[PDB]
Amino acid sequence: PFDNTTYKNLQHHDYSTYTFLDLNLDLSKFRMPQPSSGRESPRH
Amino acid sequence: ALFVHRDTPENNPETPFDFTPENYKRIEAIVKNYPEGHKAAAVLPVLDLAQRQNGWLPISAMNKVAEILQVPPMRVYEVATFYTMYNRKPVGKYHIQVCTTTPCMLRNSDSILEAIQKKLGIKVGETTPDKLFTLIEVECLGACVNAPMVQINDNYYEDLTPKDIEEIIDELKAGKIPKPGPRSGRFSCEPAGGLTSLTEPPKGPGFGVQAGL
Amino acid sequence: SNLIEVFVDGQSVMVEPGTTVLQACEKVGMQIPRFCYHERLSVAGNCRMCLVEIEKAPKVVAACAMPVMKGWNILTNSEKTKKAREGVMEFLLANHPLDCPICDQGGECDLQDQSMMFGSDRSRFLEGKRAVEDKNIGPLVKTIMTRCIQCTRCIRFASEIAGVDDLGTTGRGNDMQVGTYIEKMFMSELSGNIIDICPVGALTSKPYAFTARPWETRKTESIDVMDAVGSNIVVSTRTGEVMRILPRMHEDINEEWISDKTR
Amino acid sequence: KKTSFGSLKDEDRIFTNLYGRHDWRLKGAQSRGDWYKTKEILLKGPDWILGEVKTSGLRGRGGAGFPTGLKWSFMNKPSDGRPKYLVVNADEGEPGTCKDREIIRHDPHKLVEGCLVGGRAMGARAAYIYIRGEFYNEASNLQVAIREAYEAGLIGKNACGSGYDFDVFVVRGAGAYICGEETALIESIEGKQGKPRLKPPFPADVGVFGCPTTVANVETVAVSPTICRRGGAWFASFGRERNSGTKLFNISGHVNNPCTVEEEMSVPLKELIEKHAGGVTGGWDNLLAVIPGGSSTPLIPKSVCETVLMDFDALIQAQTGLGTAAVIVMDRSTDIVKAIARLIEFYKHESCGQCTPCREGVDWMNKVMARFVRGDARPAEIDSLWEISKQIEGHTICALGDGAAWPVQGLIRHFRPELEERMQQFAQQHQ
Ligand SMILES: Cc1cc2nc3c(=O)[nH]c(=O)nc-3n(C[C@H](O)[C@H](O)[C@H](O)COP(=O)(O)O)c2cc1C
Ligand code: SF4
Ligand code: SF4
Ligand code: SF4
Ligand code: FES
Numbered sequence: 001p002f003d004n005t006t007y008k009n010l011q012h013h014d015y016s017t018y019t020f021l022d023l024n025l026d027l028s029k030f031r032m033p034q035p036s037s038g039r040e041s042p043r044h
Numbered sequence: 045a046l047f048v049h050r051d052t053p054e055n056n057p058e059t060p061f062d063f064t065p066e067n068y069k070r071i072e073a074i075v076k077n078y079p080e081g082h083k084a085a086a087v088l089p090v091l092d093l094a095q096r097q098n099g100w101l102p103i104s105a106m107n108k109v110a111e112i113l114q115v116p117p118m119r120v121y122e123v124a125t126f127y128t129m130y131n132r133k134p135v136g137k138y139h140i141q142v143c144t145t146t147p148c149m150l151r152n153s154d155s156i157l158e159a160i161q162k163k164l165g166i167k168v169g170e171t172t173p174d175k176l177f178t179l180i181e182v183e184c185l186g187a188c189v190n191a192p193m194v195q196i197n198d199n200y201y202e203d204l205t206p207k208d209i210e211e212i213i214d215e216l217k218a219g220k221i222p223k224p225g226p227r228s229g230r231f232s233c234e235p236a237g238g239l240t241s242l243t244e245p246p247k248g249p250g251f252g253v254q255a256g257l
Numbered sequence: 258s259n260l261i262e263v264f265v266d267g268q269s270v271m272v273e274p275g276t277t278v279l280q281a282c283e284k285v286g287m288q289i290p291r292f293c294y295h296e297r298l299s300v301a302g303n304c305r306m307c308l309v310e311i312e313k314a315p316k317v318v319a320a321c322a323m324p325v326m327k328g329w330n331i332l333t334n335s336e337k338t339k340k341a342r343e344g345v346m347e348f349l350l351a352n353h354p355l356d357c358p359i360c361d362q363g364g365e366c367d368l369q370d371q372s373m374m375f376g377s378d379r380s381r382f383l384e385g386k387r388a389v390e391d392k393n394i395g396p397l398v399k400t401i402m403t404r405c406i407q408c409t410r411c412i413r414f415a416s417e418i419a420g421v422d423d424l425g426t427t428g429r430g431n432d433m434q435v436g437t438y439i440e441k442m443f444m445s446e447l448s449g450n451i452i453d454i455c456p457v458g459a460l461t462s463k464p465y466a467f468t469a470r471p472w473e474t475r476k477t478e479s480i481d482v483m484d485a486v487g488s489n490i491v492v493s494t495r496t497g498e499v500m501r502i503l504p505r506m507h508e509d510i511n512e513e514w515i516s517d518k519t520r
Numbered sequence: 521k522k523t524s525f526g527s528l529k530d531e532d533r534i535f536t537n538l539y540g541r542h543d544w545r546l547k548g549a550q551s552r553g554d555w556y557k558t559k560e561i562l563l564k565g566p567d568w569i570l571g572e573v574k575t576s577g578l579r580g581r582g583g584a585g586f587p588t589g590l591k592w593s594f595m596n597k598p599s600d601g602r603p604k605y606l607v608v609n610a611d612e613g614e615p616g617t618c619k620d621r622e623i624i625r626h627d628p629h630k631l632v633e634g635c636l637v638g639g640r641a642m643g644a645r646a647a648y649i650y651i652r653g654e655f656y657n658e659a660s661n662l663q664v665a666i667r668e669a670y671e672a673g674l675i676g677k678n679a680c681g682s683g684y685d686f687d688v689f690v691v692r693g694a695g696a697y698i699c700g701e702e703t704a705l706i707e708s709i710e711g712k713q714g715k716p717r718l719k720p721p722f723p724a725d726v727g728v729f730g731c732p733t734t735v736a737n738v739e740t741v742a743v744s745p746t747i748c749r750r751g752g753a754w755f756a757s758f759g760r761e762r763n764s765g766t767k768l769f770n771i772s773g774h775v776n777n778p779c780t781v782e783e784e785m786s787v788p789l790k791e792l793i794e795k796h797a798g799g800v801t802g803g804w805d806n807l808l809a810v811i812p813g814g815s816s817t818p819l820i821p822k823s824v825c826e827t828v829l830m831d832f833d834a835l836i837q838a839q840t841g842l843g844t845a846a847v848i849v850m851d852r853s854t855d856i857v858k859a860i861a862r863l864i865e866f867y868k869h870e871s872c873g874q875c876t877p878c879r880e881g882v883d884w885m886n887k888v889m890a891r892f893v894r895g896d897a898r899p900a901e902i903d904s905l906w907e908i909s910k911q912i913e914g915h916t917i918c919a920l921g922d923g924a925a926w927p928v929q930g931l932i933r934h935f936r937p938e939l940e941e942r943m944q945q946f947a948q949q950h951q
């Protein structure tokens with residue numbers, strides 16, 4: 001049933017110091033293989 | 045507010061710093077977000093990670109990130125000094141950041157700033173003797189319609205009055221974690237006094253789609 | 258075959274694709290004003306002293322970095338170009354210190370000379386000036402960093418020519434400071450060359466400090482014998498005394514650098 | 521043809537979760553129409569997607585207002601060996617502007633879906649989203665939405681079952697307003713100082729990691745999927761000509777109800793304040809001036825606010841600009857000189873310091889304006905200050921130099937009597 005009266009963005013009240021980088025770490029499995037420039041760095 | 049470094053007993057290249065075993069896995073995911081051969085793109089997220097582990101960036105912390113990413117230390121020093129969210133001196137457990145730019149200034153952020161000083165006894169830029177709080181002014185934090193506002197660590201506390209901010213400091217002094225968001229009668233960025241838009245139920249999948257997909 | 262056609266003050270000139278507006282002006286004998294640009298360093302485009310009007314374009318372009326397009330008429334002496342130079346020179350001198358009498362650069366300073374030739378003749382700055390603390394980078398280069406105009410020549414030379422990544426900028430805005438951040442000596446074998454490429458008296462020679470002035474030196478063009486490279490040099494003398502050693506441009510040997518021992 | 525614009529209906533609003541009263545996660549967003557027939561959109565090709573954006577009349581929502589379809593077609597070329605990227609500008613730094621924040625935290629799946637559709641139109645292999653570091657909780661919401669899209673096959677390998685591969689990356693800033701500039705954003709992602717690059721080269725040729733790149737605003741990216749689903753012609757039926765579509769507005773300052781609201785382009789500024797923000801504090805007649813599109817735009821006095829429309833062309837003729845459409849309202853009790861001086865102080869604190877006219881000029885204008893606030897100047901300094909701002913404007917690497925000159929010029933243009941009066945007060949107090 002429709003309810004426009006409540007705030008439904010309450011999850012972030014419980015985010016922590018490492019929340020963002022923990023998500024980035026879980027996402028690392030779904031990424032595609034990164035492209036390569038052919039060298040380890042511009043200084044190689 | 046000095047952009048040169050002089051070694052001191054608590055801030056020198058031999059000052060002990062290293063990432064935790066858990067934070068080395070986080071670094072690996074950060075590095076993989078960028079193309080091979082451009083690992084230097086990870087300088088900002090990795091310095092920020094070291095700040096989250098340590099609370100601030102000693103010269104040894106900058107030297108460690110430079111080594112791990114095989115970047116010249118100077119290029120790490122440039123990033124640390126350029127970006128204002130990097131703390132090159134220790135700050136209190138709670139880093140209070142009051143916005144004083146014009147939209148917030150028009151809603152009397154001076155009163156909010158004055159209240160924090162009166163309650164904590166410190167001035168702008170100072171840390172309390174117990175090292176619990178640090179106070180600074182900052183530029184617009186992108187919460188202009190919810191002014192006056194402050195950011196304490198990663199949380200925005202919005203629509204503040206002198207009483208509201210004083211309570212927040214009290215809750216923090218007791219170890220509690222106050223709820224972020226507006227302290228007025230609203231939830232986020234909506235008009236106070238009832239919505240002037242978005243009062244119908246949203247249309248579901250397929251509404252108004254042109255023919256031919 | 259590939260050469261395109263452009264115009265400098267209405268005079269036709271043929272240049273290769275990729276030639277900059279500054280280089281096209283070079284062909285007809287015009288030298289655009291500059292501070293950050295150095296032809297042996299990477300392009301920076303930050304001093305804004307090379308701004309030049311392109312006919313029919315409302316915005317002036319940075320000649321040192323903008324590549325010329327076919328049919329452009331570069332107006333090197335237009336009222337718009339002249340006002341751009343005056344405005345930029347005005348900003349450069351706003352916080353610059355009144356150091357010329359005590360500054361070793363005086364008399365051979367690109368800031369002095371381009372202020373005479375392209376800037377205004379007076380000031381309307383009525384505030385207090387920036388003051389910057391000095392930095393030690395060894396016994397050879399003295400630093401008076403209040404004179405720095407943030408051209409970044411030294412940073413680029415150290416990274417590209419000397420292959421040393423110790424210099425850089427810290428902070429931002431008016432408080433942006435060229436330096437090393439930590440206490441460090443820039444002791445390359447090519448270190449002394451940053452004195453030459455620094456357009457102002459921010460970097461100067463400690464051994465040479467205060468001993469002479471440019472107009473009074475006699476220039477003897479000679480050769481270096483500190484090694485077998487045969488670097489071409491200028492021996493500055495005065496009243497029968499050797500005062501300093503300077504590089505002499507030779508494309509096929511030392512270009513415009515010399516080693517520290519040679520210097 | 522339409523003649524009066526405003527009164528946008530709820531059925532024609534794109535960001536239908538602007539206030540967060542509904543579930544922001546995938547389940548809620550899908551039920552509201554997000555991620556619907558995205559596969560069908562992708563398989564229609566980049567030329568078709570670029571055609572719908574071109575017809576929609578969409579213009580950049582980040583502040584400059586370049587025609588979006590024309591800009592995105594710069595990347596519609598064959599690969600020359602390098603990867604191609606889309607960079608979504610979520611820096612959201614312009615004072616007064618807080619619209620991009622609500623999209624990221626309440627409508628994250630429109631941004632993620634816009635990245636895929638917009639990324640397809642450009643042939644981009646991935647999207648990097650640059651969100652300012654202060655938006656930690658909003659960045660965390662965005663990551664959760666991205667993980668949901670990955671775990672449902674909407675993005676990543678074979679996105680939406682389309683045969684197209686797409687990754688969405690979130691990179692956080694570290695506190696710098698300049699990093700919202702498109703080339704300064706790229707330099708920051710690459711790990712350097714947030715210092716803008718000169719142009720040429722243009723980002724569509726040499727961009728992030730030296731690869732073809734397009735920088736687009738959050739609102740620009742987050743409306744493209746709806747433009748494709750509902751057709752660009754529907755989007756073009758709003759606003760005036762060359763000012764098409766719906767637009768998010770931030771009304772802050774001296775209004776009864778500061779708020780963020782969606783509304784039609786070319787809505788009268790008076791109607792927007794009265795209908796949605798509850799009017800000017802103390803009645804409309806208490807209005808002094810309005811900064812209509814963020815701190816970078818010049819202010820306009822009450823006599824110009826009566827009839828001015830809120831669109832790119834209407835505000836340009838009022839000698840200002842729509843910018844980010846962030847309305848800052850100053851009632852008659854504002855010290856107008858101090859308010860503008862605090863903006864110049866902000867630009868002084870935000871200049872990257874790279875190029876001379878801004879590194880030195882902006883700081884110079886800050887010192888002059890600090891004296892103007894107290895009256896500690898001569899009237900002849902007003903024309904000097906105007907001329908100084910004209911030396912900064914149009915002579916800098918990026919537009920932050922222009923954005924610092926314009927608010928000064930807006931003040932001198934409409935409030936010189938207040939400047940001269942204050943100097944005369946100071947002179948008599950010290951005689
Ligand atoms: C100082 C400065 C700050 C800027 N900040 C932002 C910003 O925070 N968000 C944004 O979308 N564009 C910002 N811009 C504009 C961008 O440079 C660029 O025009 C825009 O991201 C292009 O996207 P669009 O075409 O969708 O508008 C800024 C520009 C300048 C000069
Ligand atoms: S660098 Fe040039 S302008 Fe500056 S003090 Fe020295 S001689 Fe004078
Ligand atoms: S020290 Fe000299 S060369 Fe280096 S940035 Fe300053 S003015 Fe340029
Ligand atoms: S105008 Fe200002 S912010 Fe932009 S590049 Fe120049 S110094 Fe940096
Ligand atoms: S002016 Fe304070 S959040 Fe924008």
Ligand code: FES
Pocket residue numbers: 290291292293294301302303304305306307308319320321322
């Ligand atoms: S010589 Fe072109 S900007 Fe410096």
Ligand SMILES: [K+]
Pocket residue numbers: 362451452453454455456457458459460461
């Ligand atoms: K020198």
